[PDB]
Design a protein around this nucleic acid. Structure first.
Ligand code: MG
Ligand code: MG
Ligand code: MG
Ligand code: MG
Ligand code: MG
Ligand code: MG
Ligand code: MG
Ligand code: MG
Ligand code: MG
Ligand code: MG
Ligand code: MG
Ligand code: MG
Ligand code: MG
Ligand code: MG
Ligand code: MG
Ligand code: MG
Ligand code: MG
Ligand code: MG
Ligand code: MG
Ligand code: MG
Ligand code: MG
Ligand code: MG
Ligand code: MG
Ligand code: MG
Ligand code: MG
Ligand code: MG
Ligand code: MG
Ligand code: MG
Ligand code: MG
Ligand code: MG
Ligand code: MG
Ligand code: MG
Ligand code: MG
Ligand code: MG
Ligand code: MG
Ligand code: MG
Ligand code: MG
Ligand code: MG
Ligand code: MG
Ligand code: MG
Ligand code: MG
Ligand code: MG
Ligand code: MG
Ligand code: MG
Ligand code: MN
Ligand code: MN
Ligand code: MN
Ligand code: MN
Ligand code: MN
Ligand code: MN
Ligand code: MN
Ligand code: MN
Ligand code: MN
Ligand code: MN
Ligand code: MN
Ligand code: MN
Ligand code: MN
Ligand code: MN
Ligand code: MN
Ligand code: MN
Ligand code: MN
Ligand code: MN
Ligand code: MN
Ligand code: MN
Ligand code: MN
Ligand code: MN
Ligand code: MN
Ligand code: MN
Ligand code: MN
Ligand code: MN
Ligand code: MN
Ligand code: MN
Ligand code: MN
Ligand code: MN
Ligand code: MN
Ligand code: MN
Ligand code: MN
Ligand code: MN
Ligand code: MN
Ligand code: MN
Ligand code: MN
Ligand code: MN
Ligand code: MN
Ligand code: MN
Ligand code: MN
Ligand code: MN
Ligand code: MN
Ligand code: MN
Ligand code: MN
Ligand code: MN
Ligand code: MN
Ligand code: MN
Ligand code: MN
Ligand code: MN
Ligand code: MN
Lengths: 49, 145, 44, 116, 112, 149, 101
RNA sequence: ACCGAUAGUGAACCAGUACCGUGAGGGAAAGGUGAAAAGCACCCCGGAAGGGGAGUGAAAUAGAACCUGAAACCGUGUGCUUACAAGUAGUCAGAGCCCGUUAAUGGGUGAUGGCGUGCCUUUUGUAGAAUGAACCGGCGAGUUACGAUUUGAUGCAAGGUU
RNA sequence: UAACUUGGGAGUCAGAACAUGGGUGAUAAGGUCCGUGUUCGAAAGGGAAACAGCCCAGACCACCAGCUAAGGUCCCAAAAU
RNA sequence: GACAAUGGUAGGAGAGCGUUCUAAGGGCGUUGAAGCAUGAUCGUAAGGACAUGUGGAGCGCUUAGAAGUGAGAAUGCCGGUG
């Protein structure tokens, strides 16, 4: 390992999903639609009605 | 674009033809004349230019109909003035000035395009048996099928 | 009543084809080297 | 760190706008309009690439039909007669032969009227 | 060679200056001088002064034959626009453009 | 932060009847000079690794130096030098760590020398060990690293 | 003289001396090539084959092996969120004919 | 492994200031000649403003509204083209005229023919006469901390770990 | 040629027409409420003048190649006066 | 060399392009950097070069690291200009 040739273990790492950046990507509504996919997202943590 | 042919002003010479209308049905003559005019029939046909020939129609007056002549088949026309559908002359119209009856019929078989409108200018219907246009020495053309 | 769509560069230009002062009627002035409007006075 | 936005995108939009060349006025100037016009331009180009293949087939068919009509035979029967004789030579070829060599096309015509 | 002079930042609107300029363009120096003198628009004295100066430094700086000259080209370009406003009814105020123009004139002769 | 920006939290204009868009603060994120959404905030950037791994790494570093070259020397001397460059009478390449038994001063004041660095050995980075090019544990220090295994 | 060869997906009217272009032949550049499949010949004396004229072949020098100018297959579906842009250069041979039959 | 003049303090500039309110209070915009002011003597047009010479300068096509100088937008010159034609502006076909390239089955214009009701949102369904955008520019939205969980990688392993 | 099991991540809970078996309505509705099927949604292409839901039929990309489907073959307009 | 598969909204999954900063390595640059402008250039895409002009300092490449990482729409904010 020569410091200008570092290589992570195959399978050690992979890129985070950046949603909301384009359309070809596949997130632009980002996820869901029309519902409780507001910033609150208040599915009250575990319950129905 | 591998080698198919398209005619232009160089190439595409066009002849004159005389067609007696006497003894003919209106549509049956009008359609075939529309073909001579659009310029099919010849194999140097190509859509974006006038490949068509010139057609004089002699004896417009002797053109023939069927079921109902002066009866039934009306020729309507609005003037874009309100209620003014001054839309009369029955298909009878050949009594009055028939060269329009034929030229209109044949024109209705031509495409609405500027080219189609140029192609229509090559018709020359005449109700009488003689034509002025001998100088462009026309041939007679027997009306096929 | 207000415009419903904007005039194009080109529309507005066709509109202004008649909008121009034309060359004044002028003539060879007093033999004094001047230049004056037609039918109007020489000035000294 | 902070990525100041500048100068990737003035050069993107520059590309798309350069794509809109012969376009009328604002369609060849602004990015939005040019983007629309080029997208649709591509969509039309995709349909029209398919349909062109139709337009040319139909052209040859009309001219062939013409060459046949000159010989008192319909295109409809000249094709069946060629197939029956197994001539298997396409319409672009047939039309161009009709235009370049009336004699040879005549030979084909008789070959088709034969075997009927 | 063929000479030029500019009147930068003049307080006339270019849309207006261009009106007279269009009369002047391509005319012989005397005609253009006349037309400038007799035209009733406001830009006329200004463009007069500019065609004049262009002719002057055409003579002193290039020893040009002041008779044989033509107005090779002439035009106005947008200058900086000072921005004002007028008060209107119900306390609102509205924009106003005090526009300015870079007039340019170029006298010439036998080009080569 | 938007709470942070110096401006006020008065509503820029009424919710309806303007034909302007609804607005809440002149310091809202879509505004010029408004609050920043989700920018950098101060934070640690630092983490733990299992100890055995770290030893395995140091070991791996040095063993990588032996796959190449990490040469061994007698020991140290005096008080101030540009003769250390002359002590590259041994070939000793360009990037340089001199490992020493236990905080040798003086040798440590042979520094402003471009590409060279020294530590103890109880120290001994898993980094300087790699930029490295060529290490030299003196000899005492080499057996020290051996004892620390 | 006049000859019709069934080579690509398609037929060609080669004229002896004439440059042509067809889908790539997987043969050497500069090499000579010959088409086994020929339908028709013309000029004075005319052979008109069934499937093929029973013997004749057109011949040609290979001039170049290359790829056509890129076209840009961009398509999209309005209001539905998709679009798709692919590129395309189509490979071809450029034979030059010599000696029909 | 913070900002680099719409950023970073509201304030890189004599900012809590112009300006706004009876008042508490609110609260901006605005950085860059050059290495050196060597900041254009002098002549010419002009009342001046401005400009052409002549000069300083590597450069003023660096001249003070001064580094670079994009786009919208405004103008001058024109090669091809257009005054019987019904047009979401293009696309496919194509003569004609003009030109000559990162030289490759080239570039510009376009008589004429075919095909063809922008985008976004939102909808069962929008050319839609449903919403949104005058244009161009910059700025403008899944982040971080801590926990839980699961997968991937690595180390030890009846032990692992601080 | 799939099926099930456990685990990670979801979206969806406004539906539309047509054919058919029905309720409701007036054997009214482009009505409404269920059962079965198809298409649209989320599907471009050819036919039905135009015409989401009908008919043929599911576009990896290129061709100035060929056979067909539903529809069609006097002219507009490819193909039988 | 065969032979299959490759319409698609919410959505799941995968491979990648590019921007800033860091590290190490290796390079260009007043014989002219970035930026800008034009071009008929290249790759399957995001995109990458090359030449000439402008400009007058700073920049790329490779491997990996990290993010204020990508805009056309919010009657979005500011500026300019129709
Ligand atoms: Mg609860
Ligand atoms: Mg081609
Ligand atoms: Mg070709
Ligand atoms: Mg009446
Ligand atoms: Mg009446
Ligand atoms: Mg009346
Ligand atoms: Mg019409
Ligand atoms: Mg018959
Ligand atoms: Mg005007
Ligand atoms: Mg054009
Ligand atoms: Mg595009
Ligand atoms: Mg189309
Ligand atoms: Mg205004
Ligand atoms: Mg708080
Ligand atoms: Mg020291
Ligand atoms: Mg293309
Ligand atoms: Mg500030
Ligand atoms: Mg008050
Ligand atoms: Mg000077
Ligand atoms: Mg100057
Ligand atoms: Mg300025
Ligand atoms: Mg400009
Ligand atoms: Mg002209
Ligand atoms: Mg003009
Ligand atoms: Mg067209
Ligand atoms: Mg051309
Ligand atoms: Mg057609
Ligand atoms: Mg609605
Ligand atoms: Mg429901
Ligand atoms: Mg319901
Ligand atoms: Mg029923
Ligand atoms: Mg019912
Ligand atoms: Mg219903
Ligand atoms: Mg549809
Ligand atoms: Mg229906
Ligand atoms: Mg039609
Ligand atoms: Mg019959
Ligand atoms: Mg370079
Ligand atoms: Mg470029
Ligand atoms: Mg340009
Ligand atoms: Mg770069
Ligand atoms: Mg990089
Ligand atoms: Mg990285
Ligand atoms: Mg906006
Ligand atoms: Mn990814
Ligand atoms: Mn999706
Ligand atoms: Mn809903
Ligand atoms: Mn939404
Ligand atoms: Mn939801
Ligand atoms: Mn909230
Ligand atoms: Mn004008
Ligand atoms: Mn920075
Ligand atoms: Mn008042
Ligand atoms: Mn606050
Ligand atoms: Mn409050
Ligand atoms: Mn408004
Ligand atoms: Mn701030
Ligand atoms: Mn700046
Ligand atoms: Mn006051
Ligand atoms: Mn300074
Ligand atoms: Mn004076
Ligand atoms: Mn002065
Ligand atoms: Mn000098
Ligand atoms: Mn500088
Ligand atoms: Mn400047
Ligand atoms: Mn007319
Ligand atoms: Mn005309
Ligand atoms: Mn219409
Ligand atoms: Mn073309
Ligand atoms: Mn149409
Ligand atoms: Mn969007
Ligand atoms: Mn509705
Ligand atoms: Mn709308
Ligand atoms: Mn409307
Ligand atoms: Mn709404
Ligand atoms: Mn609006
Ligand atoms: Mn904008
Ligand atoms: Mn979240
Ligand atoms: Mn339910
Ligand atoms: Mn019903
Ligand atoms: Mn049902
Ligand atoms: Mn939906
Ligand atoms: Mn119908
Ligand atoms: Mn249709
Ligand atoms: Mn068939
Ligand atoms: Mn059938
Ligand atoms: Mn037909
Ligand atoms: Mn797919
Ligand atoms: Mn498929
Ligand atoms: Mn995903
Ligand atoms: Mn930079
Ligand atoms: Mn350059
Ligand atoms: Mn470089
Ligand atoms: Mn990287
Ligand atoms: Mn951002």
């Amino acid at each position: 390992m020569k410091l200008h040739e570092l290589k992570p273990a195959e399978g050690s790492r992979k890129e985070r999903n950046r949603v909301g950046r384009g359309v070809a990507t596949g997130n632009g509504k980002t996820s869901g639609r029309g519902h409780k996919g507001q910033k609150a997202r208040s599915g009250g943590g575990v319950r129905p009605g | 674009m591998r080698q198919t042919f398209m005619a232009n002003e160089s190439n595409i010479e066009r002849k004159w033809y005389v067609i007696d209308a006497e003894g003919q049905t209106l549509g049956r003559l009008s359609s075939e004349v529309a073909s001579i005019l659009r310029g099919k029939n010849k194999v140097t046909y190509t859509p974006h230019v006038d490949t068509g020939d010139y057609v004089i129609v002699i004896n417009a007056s002797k053109i023939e109909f069927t079921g109902n002549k002066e009866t039934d088949k009306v020729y309507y026309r609005h003037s874009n003035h309100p209620g003014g559908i001054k839309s009369i002359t029955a298909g009878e119209l050949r009594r009055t000035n028939p060269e329009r009856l034929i030229e209109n019929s044949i024109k209705g078989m031509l495409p609405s395009t500027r080219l189609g409108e140029k192609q229509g200018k090559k018709l020359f219907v005449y109700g009488g048996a003689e034509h002025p246009h001998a100088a462009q020495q026309p041939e007679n053309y027997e009306l096929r099928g | 009543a207000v415009p419903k769509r904007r005039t194009s560069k080109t529309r507005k230009n066709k509109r202004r084809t008649h909008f121009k002062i034309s060359v004044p009627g002028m003539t060879e002035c007093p033999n004094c080297g001047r230049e004056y409007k037609l039918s109007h006075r020489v000035c000294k | 760190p902070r990525v100041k936005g500048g100068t990737v995108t003035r050069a993107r939009r520059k590309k798309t706008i350069k794509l809109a060349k012969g376009y009328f006025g604002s369609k060849h100037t602004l990015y939005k309009v040019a983007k629309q016009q080029v997208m649709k331009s591509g969509q039309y180009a995709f349909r029209d690439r398919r349909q062109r293949k139709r337009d040319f087939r139909k052209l040859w068919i009309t001219r062939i039909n013409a060459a046949a009509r000159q010989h008192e035979m319909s295109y409809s029967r000249l094709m069946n007669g060629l197939k029956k004789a197994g001539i298997d030579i396409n319409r672009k070829m047939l039309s161009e032969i009709a235009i370049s060599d009336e004699k040879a096309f005549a030979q084909l015509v008789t070959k088709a009227k034969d075997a009927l | 060679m063929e000479a030029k002079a500019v009147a930068r930042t003049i307080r006339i609107a270019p849309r207006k200056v261009r009106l007279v300029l269009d009369l002047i363009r391509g005319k012989n120096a005397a005609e253009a001088i006349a037309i400038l003198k007799l035209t009733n628009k406001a830009s006329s004295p200004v463009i007069e002064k500019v065609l004049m100066s262009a002719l002057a430094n055409a003579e002193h700086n290039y020893d040009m034959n002041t008779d044989e000259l033509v107005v090779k080209e002439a035009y106005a370009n947008e200058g900086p626009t000072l921005k004002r406003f007028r008060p209107r009814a119900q306390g609102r105020a509205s924009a106003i453009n005090k526009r300015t123009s870079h007039i340019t004139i170029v006298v010439s002769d036998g080009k080569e | 932060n938007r709470s942070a920006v110096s401006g006020g939290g008065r509503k820029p204009w009424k919710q309806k009847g303007t034909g302007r868009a609804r607005q809440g603060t002149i310091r809202a994120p879509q505004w010029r000079g408004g609050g920043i959404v989700f920018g950098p905030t101060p934070r640690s950037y630092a983490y733990k690794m299992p100890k055995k791994m770290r030893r395995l790494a140091l070991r791996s570093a040095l063993s990588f130096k032996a796959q190449e070259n990490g040469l061994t020397v007698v020991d140290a001397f005096n008080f101030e030098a540009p003769k250390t460059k002359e002590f590259k009478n041994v070939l000793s390449t360009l990037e340089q760590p001199k490992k020493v038994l236990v905080v040798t001063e003086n040798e440590d004041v042979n520094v402003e020398l471009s590409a060279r660095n020294i530590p103890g050995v109880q120290v001994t980075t898993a980094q300087g060990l790699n930029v490295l090019d060529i290490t030299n544990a003196d000899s005492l220090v080499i057996t020290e690293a051996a004892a620390k295994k | 003289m006049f000859a019709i060869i069934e080579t690509g997906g398609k037929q060609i009217k080669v004229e002896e001396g004439q440059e042509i272009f067809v889908e790539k032949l997987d043969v050497n550049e500069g090499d000579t090539f010959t088409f086994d499949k020929v339908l028709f010949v013309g000029g004075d004396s005319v052979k008109v084959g069934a499937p093929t004229v029973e013997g004749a072949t057109v011949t040609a020098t290979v001039n170049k092996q290359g790829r056509g100018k890129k076209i840009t297959v961009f398509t999209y579906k309005r209001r539905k969120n998709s679009k798709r842009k692919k590129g395309h250069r189509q490979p071809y041979t450029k034979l030059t004919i010599d000696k029909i039959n």
